[PDB]
A paper describes a structure:
All chaperonin monomers share a common three-domain structure: an apical domain involved in substrate recognition, an equatorial domain containing the ATP-binding site that drives the conformational changes that occur during the chaperonin functional cycle, and an intermediate domain linking the two by relaying signals. We selected several AC nodes for protein synthesis and purification, including the last common ancestors of Group I (ACI), Group II (ACII), and Group III (ACIII), along with the ancestor of the Fibrobacteres–Chlorobi–Bacteroidetes (FCB) Group (AFCB).
ACII formed a heterogeneous mixture of eight-subunit oligomers, including both single and double rings, even without ATP. ACII was purified as a mixture of monomers and oligomers, and the presence of ATP triggered the typical conformational changes in chaperonins, transitioning between open and closed states. The 2D and 3D analysis of the particles revealed both single- and double-ring structures in both open and closed configurations. When comparing this structure with modern chaperonins such as E. coli GroEL (Group I) or the group II eukaryotic chaperonin CCT, we found that ACII possesses a built-in helical lid protrusion, similar to CCT. In ACII, a similar salt bridge exists between H299 and E334. Altogether, these observations suggest that while ACII possesses a built-in lid that reduces reliance on a GroES-type cochaperonin for cavity closure, the resulting closure is less complete than that of CCT subunits, where total sealing prevents solute entry or exit. Despite its lack of detectable ATPase activity, ACII proved to be highly effective at protecting LDH from heat inactivation.
Numbering used by the authors:
A (entry chain G), B (entry chain H), C (entry chain J): 19 to 242, 253 to 524
D (entry chain F): 19 to 106
Write the structure that this text describes.
């Protein structure tokens, strides 16, 4: 029963990632043969760098990748939904229903599920500050410490509004646009708008001018013998330094005094650069070098011989500030475009990475909320409501597809059960309470794991975007279906 | 019993590929030692990159290759028919019939099978749009999602009609003639007629002219020291750039400004090509480079010294459009011939490959329908009708060949049984229903796996080209025959 | 698959007993741990004293016992028919038909098969001597040597007619009524009507009167110390002989002079019996003693004290004839009832037992023919005719019971296939020839294994009573059905 | 119970470093495959260069490093407190 084997592998991954769904998501420990350990709770990492020899499991990598690509959030919801869906699918196969009937029933159930989620979702304008803060806090949830939730949410909404590039309504609040720097210790209160890309490298030379207002900023990427007579070696050294003088002189004619180079340096090179007072940062990555080129306005010039004054950028300020322990060049004043890197502070490296993922997911969610402008109650409320309407549809329909639709309803209902279980509440009792509440006509009663009770989600500020839940359902459906559609494992010829 | 061993291997492959026959064919997962996984359901792939140590099984590779070469559709049908034929052959040798008598009976059976398939087939004009759409949907069936069936069928017929090169009645609608590009995400609605081969490569230089109306397009394939004195190296560099200047100058005298090169480039090379505004795409394969040469009209010039203005092609437009995520040069306006590559969009990589195979099979089927102009009802209806007339022939013939012909009829009837089994219906009951229906005189009652019932195929739009089924029967017979003709495995001297 | 296991066991027994069906039945060799060996070919013995650990096979003991009880002929036919029925049942479960549908189909098949056999059977009067001889030869076939077939058939019909006790039409030709004796060597020409039960024991005393015309025959069953003074032993002996004297005196007053006693004797006892000239045979079994009591007319007297002249029987003659090697008392002249034992001569012990079984089967078959007065052509002709009419019924009936009906027809045709295989002819060719013949309207064309061809059975004298075939089909049906009706093996509590 | 395993590893480390808390802290010895030996009682060193395959224990490396970075004193107090906290 290779299908049973694949279902078992998907079940194993689903139960593995089940425990990390919610504000109290019990984190997970990723250990590799090299011995490096990173503690994370966001499901994207746990699906990213885990070992999977089972190839049916290996498809869930692709499922999570697609989820992250379109939405960027809800991967753990998608995987848990897929787990519950394959639970009930296996349940229907031992009863006797053919798999294709299960697939057809799940397809119909999910079409009506997206339709139901469209109806139930409450709309939001982009000016109701409390609602945006609630969405930001709900997405922020899971990873950040309980203390700094209000602070990071406030900074998130502040950055989103202040850097709101009104590109015809759709604000281009990209992940690489908001300005943070990474550093151990201190706190999260350094997530401020510093108008420029800050590099985590020290100045090469002490007497290099640390302060340069309205500096002529340049961006470069190029890396900055046969002897016969006794003085021939000195002659070669003379002509290399002469041509070096020539290139840096035609650079100075353009006026460049601040440079960030993609490659390494040499002691003599940095010495003669600082002779004229030229900044040079080395080993600058491709992505961050491109970001710096966009921000500073100095186009990357591989062939530096054609550099002109028109090719140079400008920055309002460049400064070396001894913030914290490490030394950095706090570049500030890149006035062309809002461009930045996802580098954020915390106390210890695990917390640094956790807060990095948290802020990334936070901007993702508020961006989705602003774009789509539809928010659905979270905390399992949307799942229970869609399950109830799916059961109404089951009452409407008849046949052995009704069993499949009921299976889909139960699998969708599984998510609030997990969210309650990670909260410490008993799953069956609180889930029955949720069902009974939703049978009274109200729609926003969910589970709040911060308070550890069942309450109105709208008053508790627990709301997730509609689109993230739509894609969670869609990806879970596509995972369950394409894992069901397999029959047997066969050895495939390796491409030579 | 080495014959029994070969039969067992053929049965193993037949049962492996049986499950992937029909609209609801449960897909198969091809896993290799490298760990790459591709989900496929078209039997051609499953027979192509599977490991087969058994040589009797290895012959079915050649059978499938022949099937794809002549027909291009029906490898799964051919292999399942061969499996069923060897099923009943194994029975008949169990009874006591000598193998040569089984071969004789099978040969006569398939002669009359091709004859009756010729008579039963309903003819089609190339102007009955609904019939062509039905054929395209039936062949399209199997691999695409249920949502985009009508869409992709519409684009298939639209491309076939619009690119109908009337070459004396036989329209040259080749697989490499219709214009699609491959890209992750988006949808299948980009399968439009873009009159030119679009390359999935970015421009080398930003300031390279993205827009060039009526551009002079060229096609190239060539790849674009002892020091004594201090300046000998500089003189060598000077003469290399001088001859580079010379060859590109006599190129510019021809007027070429758009180039697609077969080999790599260098940073200085792309810099000095973009100095004059010359497009250059690298690492273009042999096949797609030949396609570009055919489309653009610029003959491939290995010895570029003989390039002349007469040798240059022309294109109405070349444009870089940021469609989706990947940056590509959307070349459009190649006015000489309709030429393109089989590269098609979808959501994820597995789905991308699935719809690529689907669209390829779709054009193959409509091409076969337009060429032959004879369509047979699908859904197993043709199989049942041919089996019924074969049983009439059995009633005519007396002797021990009658048992072989009845064996052929049962093996042929196995296809509708498989098609019902993959649909979820019980095989024996629906098979008996099909036989009873065909005994009433009507000919089009089959199995529709979308609706999951038995219905008239002609009103359900489930119809296959007659040539595809003819070649399926013929290839299955030649597989079963020449697998039966073997006696024993012996070690053969390896060629030194 | 314990049902598959039971089917396999029944298959093994069916194939074991298949080879002994017909005139040319390859005999079977029964060897036991004691080392005694008996060569037999009647399937009755083969099913009786074979070892079977498998319980499902152990049921076939009961099937064969029932067959012998009702019919007395056709155990091998029943077992082979059960084997072929389970052949086709196993294939039908392979296709997917539920077992209960097969049971229902077989029930309907066998109701109609009994009806068909009733119609096809040709009637016979009890005075057509050639027809009775043909029936006797057909039944006697299988076991008797080819030389003495005509002879033993002639004696069979002669004994049946001469000992025809007209009990209201139903002649009581019992197996224990016709007079034969067993003795090694000689020949079968001693199967003559000797009017009396003849006991394989020598006279106890030489001077015992061997010849006694109109002898007063008696039948008995009873078996024919403290010392103080020297002569007390002698007085005890005197009174024992005195009481012996008075009991044999009151016997002599009745007049008995011939006795056949159930128990042993003593030297003095036989001496004083022969003093007056009294015959005494010892160790006569229960069955043969009861037979002698019936034949001689002397009721068995446990308490001999009440024996009277009225209680004595009479016999026309008693004689000791030194026929062959062993010495014997050829008792002849028991005038009350025809009573005898199944003891028959041949050359060797194996041939003795073979001839005994063959003659018993011959009287059984001729008795059945006289009783029922309906005879069907044998040699597989009846099976093929019933199969053809069953196929006509299948053409009448529509549904999945038609498949079961066809299964029953093929399982019924398997009998002529076996009968041809044991005859040396090729099975498929002669089966096809038989089917073609029966399709031309004639109904008596069968297989004659003596001539080794296919010919009309009625002119070949190959005809077997209809009731035997009816019971064969019925027993095979019950066997196949109740073997199919089992699910799995469970350990049963042993009764304490 | 992988949580029980992690708690057991943390307990083992806590009990190991428990004995070196105070003026009369019984010192510990650090022996490596090279054979070099250093006698130390400050828990910083003890948590510094000890072999720990268990990764849950390997987090206590980072805990001690944070402690030394901010405070510079109290690594043994922190680890013993963590041990007692995980006890209860
Ligand atoms: N404050 C909250 N209280 C209770 N449940 C919450 C809260 N915030 C979010 N959730 C639940 O957590 C789910 C998202 O979990 P999360 O782990 O953040 O997703 P992902 O792992 O994909 O980032 C939401 O669908 C919602 O039901
Ligand atoms: N719409 C349909 N409904 C039911 N059966 C279909 C339908 N379309 C095709 N089929 C069946 O599937 C067969 C072709 O299966 P397919 O897997 O496409 O072949 P291949 O694997 O060789 O491409 C046809 O011969 C037909 O009997
Ligand atoms: N002379 C014959 N020639 C050919 N077949 C015969 C002949 N006599 C009997 N048979 C076949 O043998 C069958 C009976 O076989 P037999 O072994 O005698 O049964 P059993 O073992 O029960 O006594 C009959 O049904 C008939 O078809
Ligand atoms: N003179 C003392 N008498 C008793 N206890 C002491 C004394 N000095 C320090 N302590 C205890 O030892 C603790 C610090 O132990 P120590 O091993 O020095 O810490 P660390 O190993 O981090 O340097 C203090 O919290 C205190 O309770
Ligand atoms: Mg989330
Ligand atoms: Mg096909
Ligand atoms: Mg018999
Ligand atoms: Mg201290």
């Amino acid at each position: 029963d290779a299908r049973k084997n694949n279902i078992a592998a998907a079940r194993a991954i689903a139960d593995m990632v089940k425990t990390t769904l919610g504000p109290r998501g019990m984190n997970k420990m990723l250990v590799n043969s090299l011995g490096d350990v990173t503690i994370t709770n966001d499901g994207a990492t746990i699906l990213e760098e885990m070992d999977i020899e089972h190839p049916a499991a290996k498809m869930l990598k692709e499922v999570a990748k697609a989820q992250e690509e379109e939405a960027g959030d809800g991967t753990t919801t998608a995987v848990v939904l897929a787990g519950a869906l394959l639970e009930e699918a296996e349940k229907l196969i031992e009863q006797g229903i053919h798999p294709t009937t299960i697939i057809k029933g799940y397809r119909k159930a999910v079409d009506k599920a997206l339709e139901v989620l469209e109806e139930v979702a409450i709309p939001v304008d982009p000016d109701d500050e409390e609602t945006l803060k609630a969405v930001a806090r709900t997405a922020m949830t899971g990873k950040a410490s309980e203390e700094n939730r209000e602070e990071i949410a406030d900074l998130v909404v502040e950055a989103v509004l202040s850097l709101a590039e009104d590109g015809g309504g759709k604000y281009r609040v990209d992940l690489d646009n908001i300005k943070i720097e990474k550093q151990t210790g201190g706190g999260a209160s350094d997530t401020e708008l510093i108008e420029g890309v800050v590099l985590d490298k020290e100045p090469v030379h002490e007497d290099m001018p640390k302060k340069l207002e309205n500096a002529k900023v340049a961006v470069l990427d190029a890396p900055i013998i046969s002897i016969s007579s006794p003085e021939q070696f000195q002659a070669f050294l003379d002509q290399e330094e002469k041509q070096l003088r020539e290139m840096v002189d035609k650079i100075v004619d353009t006026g460049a005094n601040v440079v960030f180079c993609e490659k390494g340096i040499d002691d003599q090179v940095e010495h003669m650069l600082a002779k004229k007072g030229i900044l040079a940062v080395r080993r600058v990555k491709k992505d961050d070098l491109e970001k710096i080129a966009k921000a500073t306005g100095a186009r990357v010039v591989s062939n530096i011989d054609e550099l002109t004054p028109e090719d140079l950028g400008h920055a309002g300020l460049v400064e070396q500030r001894k913030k914290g322990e490490d030394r950095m060049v706090f570049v500030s004043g890149c006035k062309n475009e809002p461009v930045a890197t996802i580098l954020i502070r915390a106390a210890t490296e695990h917390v640094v990475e956790e807060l990095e993922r948290a802020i990334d997911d936070a901007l993702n969610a508020v961006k989705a909320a602003i774009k789509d402008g539809k928010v659905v109650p979270g905390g399992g409320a949307a799942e229970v409501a869609v399950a109830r309407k799916l059961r109404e549809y089951a009452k409407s329909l008849s046949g052995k597809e009704q069993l499949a639709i009921e299976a889909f309803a139960d699998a969708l209902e599984e998510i609030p059960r997990t969210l309650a279980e990670n909260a410490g509440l008993d799953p069956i009792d609180t889930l029955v309470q949720l069902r009974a509440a939703h049978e009274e006509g109200d729609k926003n009663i969910g589970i709040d794991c911060l308070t550890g009770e069942v309450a109105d989600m709208l008053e508790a500020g627990v709301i997730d975007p509609a689109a993230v839940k739509k894609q969670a359902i869609k990806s879970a459906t596509e995972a369950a279906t394409m894992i069901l559609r397999i029959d047997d494992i066969i050895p495939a010829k390796a491409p030579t």
